[PDB]
């Protein structure tokens, strides 16, 4: 029975290697990674891979791995797929830990924009969780943490992390991680998956997919939002993506809204993540 080597980049930046049978469905590999990670609350997570166009795709756990990676390497990342709006609701500390690791990468990468003060507060909770109480012996006036906190590090930011870390004496790792999450969950781009698109007039927009619905960013001046409940049908055709809106009270007709995506694969990818979000966040 022939097996393919799989390499998975974990949220701590380390590499997990395993073998699965070459006709394996994605769930087989995901189950192995989650057992490796001692992760029970698996529903929020998934594996990604890069397609022939170097686009991030979710590995569909119900489909054969080989029919998704196709010509590409069996190389994956372990990621948060569904960001919980209230991480305090999660049953296990280790789930919140992996969600913290993902968010730290969302922040350093710039996918999750954050004010100076919130970057320093999030950083200070990470340092408290990982090193425990502030020790002066480690940090002088010239201290720079090994921890990556932000897309652009400044001495002022490092100083503010230390100032806040000092305030956290006695805080346990789970407690610090829960504070991390209570701050991060409020950020306007928390758990928003962004897709480049054009509206029905050709104006460049971003579509954001998240727990609360589909967001349209025309810029910073005028953001439209469609809460999942309103959305009856999500569809794609050629390079186009459509949502069927519920009729408003006393309106005769449903309303269908249309966007242009970069190519047919980008339209299908946006459709699939919307359908998946739509189901996930109506069902608890
Ligand atoms: C935040 C939210 O609002 C409505 C539903 C949910 C939710 O978390 N659903 C879910 C959790 C775990 N597995 C599957 C679905």
From Swiss-Prot:
Physiological role: Tumor suppressor that inhibits cell proliferation and promotes apoptosis. Modulates the activity of protein arginine N-methyltransferases, including PRMT3 and PRMT5.
Tissue: Expressed at high levels in brain, with lower levels in kidney, intestine, and testis. Detected in lung.
Name this protein carries in UniProt: Band 4.1-like protein 3
Ranges for domain FERM: 4-284
Known partners and oligomeric status: Interacts (via FERM domain) with CADM1. Interacts (via FERM domain) with PRMT3; the interaction is direct and inhibits the protein-arginine N-methyltransferase activity of PRMT3. Interacts with PRMT5. Interacts with PRMT6.
Full-sequence range covered: 107 to 390 of 1087
Subcellular locations according to the entry: Cytoplasm, Cytoskeleton; Cell junction; Cell membrane; Cytoplasm
Organism: Homo sapiens (Human)
């Amino acid at each position: 029975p022939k097996s393919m080597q799989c390499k998975v980049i974990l949220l701590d930046g380390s590499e997990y290697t395993c073998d699965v049978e070459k006709r394996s469905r994605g769930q087989v590999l995901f189950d192995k990674v989650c057992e490796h990670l001692n992760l029970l609350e698996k529903d929020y997570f998934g594996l990604t891979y890069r397609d022939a166009e170097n686009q991030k795709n979710w590995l569909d756990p119900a489909k054969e791995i080989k029919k998704q990676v196709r010509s590409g390497a069996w190389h994956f990342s372990f990621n948060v797929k569904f960001y919980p709006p209230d991480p305090a609701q999660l049953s296990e500390d280790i789930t919140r830990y992996y969600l913290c690791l993902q968010l730290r990468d969302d922040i350093v990468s710039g996918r999750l924009p954050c004010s100076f003060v919130t970057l320093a507060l999030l950083g200070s909770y990470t340092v408290q969780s990982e090193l425990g109480d502030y020790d002066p012996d480690e940090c002088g006036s010239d201290y720079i943490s090994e921890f990556r906190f932000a897309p652009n590090h400044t001495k002022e930011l490092e100083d503010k992390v230390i100032e806040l870390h000092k305030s956290h004496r006695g805080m346990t790792p789970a407690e610090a991680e829960m504070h991390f999450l209570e701050n991060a969950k409020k950020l306007s781009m928390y758990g928003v998956d962004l897709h480049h698109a054009k509206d029905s007039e050709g104006v460049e927009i971003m579509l954001g997919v998240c727990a609360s619905g589909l967001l349209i960013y025309r810029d910073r001046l005028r953001i439209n939002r469609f809460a999942w409940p309103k959305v009856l049908k999500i569809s794609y055709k050629r390079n186009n993506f459509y949502i069927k809106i519920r009729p408003g009270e006393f309106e005769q007709f449903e309303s269908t809204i249309g966007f242009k995506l970069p190519n047919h694969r980008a339209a299908k990818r946006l459709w699939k993540v919307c359908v998946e979000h739509h189901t996930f966040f109506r069902l608890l």
